Each structure stands twice: as structure tokens, then as C-alpha cells.
């Protein structure tokens, strides 16, 4: 499946680490600092698309970690999860796992395909977690820059 090695990096210059094993937290990164910063691999998988809208799946470079949105009380929920590292990653990925790419005036949002609506989104503080956010509209950051690496 064709895959993009990548980091991610919010429209205030926040950069993307592991918290614990199985949490992001967004936080201002610099210097050599800048080392401790997580790389996606980037999928694209089947959905729906637009020249505007496009479906991805998010896994860690080289973990057999994926994003996914997930019911947890009543609640969209982004977490990371574990799969079976000789499955995956697939054309065909599972609803939960797939975000739309969306390319909004060289920025990039994520929807979830599976909450519409719902948005990887950060926090304005330094040291929180990356989240699905229900609201776009000027409390919590929605959209990225995106770079390439040389991988």
C-alpha cells in the first residue's frame, strides 16, 4: 500500500512525542530536542476521495501502532493501537483507523471517517495530549504542517 514517512507539526509550531506507550502529547520542540519526535507512516488506503479529501491510515514508522477513533464513554476517543504486525498495514483498513486528509489553504486537518466531524486536534498548552476534538472554531488546534523525511 503506498505509505509516506512523515512528522506532524500543529499551526503553532508544537511538535508530536510519545507520552506513555500508547499516548501523543503535542509540546515546543527545538535544538537537537527535536530528536524525540515521532515519525508516522502515513497510508493510503481505500475510502472516500475527493482532490480534496483524502483517506489515510496513521502508524508510527516502525511500531505496530496505529491511530484509531474508538467509542470510550459515550465519546469519540483517539488512542494508540496495538496490531498484528504481519497484517497490517492494508489498502483495505479497518473505519476506526482511517482519517480524511483534508488540504485546507497548505494545511492539513484530520477527520475521522468514523466520527464525522471529529478532528485529531491539540491543545493550546504545552504537554497535553493529542485528542478527537469535536469543535473546529478557535479553542483547540486542528490543523497540521506536514513534513517529509528521508526514510
Not at 503506498?2 to 512525542?17: E, H, I, P, Y
Not at 474508538?70 to 496495538?82: G, N
Request: glycine fraction near 6%; charged fraction near 25%.
Amino acid at each position: 500500500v503506498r505509505s509516506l514517512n512523515c512528522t506532524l507539526r500543529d499551526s503553532q509550531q508544537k511538535s508530536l512525542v510519545m507520552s506513555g506507550p500508547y499516548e501523543l502529547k503535542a509540546l515546543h520542540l527545538q535544538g537537537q530536542d527535536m530528536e524525540q519526535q515521532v515519525v508516522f507512516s502515513m497510508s493510503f488506503v481505500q475510502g472516500e476521495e475527493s482532490n480534496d479529501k483524502i483517506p489515510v491510515a496513521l502508524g508510527l514508522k516502525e511500531k505496530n501502532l496505529y491511530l484509531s477513533a474508538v467509542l470510550k464513554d459515550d465519546k469519540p476517543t483517539l488512542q494508540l493501537e496495538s496490531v498484528d504486525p504481519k497484517n497490517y498495514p492494508k489498502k483495505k483498513m479497518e473505519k476506526r483507523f482511517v482519517f480524511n486528509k483534508i488540504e485546507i489553504n497548505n494545511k492539513l486537518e484530520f477527520e475521522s471517517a468514523q466520527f464525522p466531524n471529529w478532528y485529531i486536534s491539540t491543545s493550546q498548552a504545552e504537554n497535553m495530549p493529542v485528542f478527537l476534538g469535536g469543535t473546529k472554531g478557535g479553542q483547540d488546534i486542528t490543523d497540521f504542517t506536514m513534513q517529509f523525511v528521508s526514510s
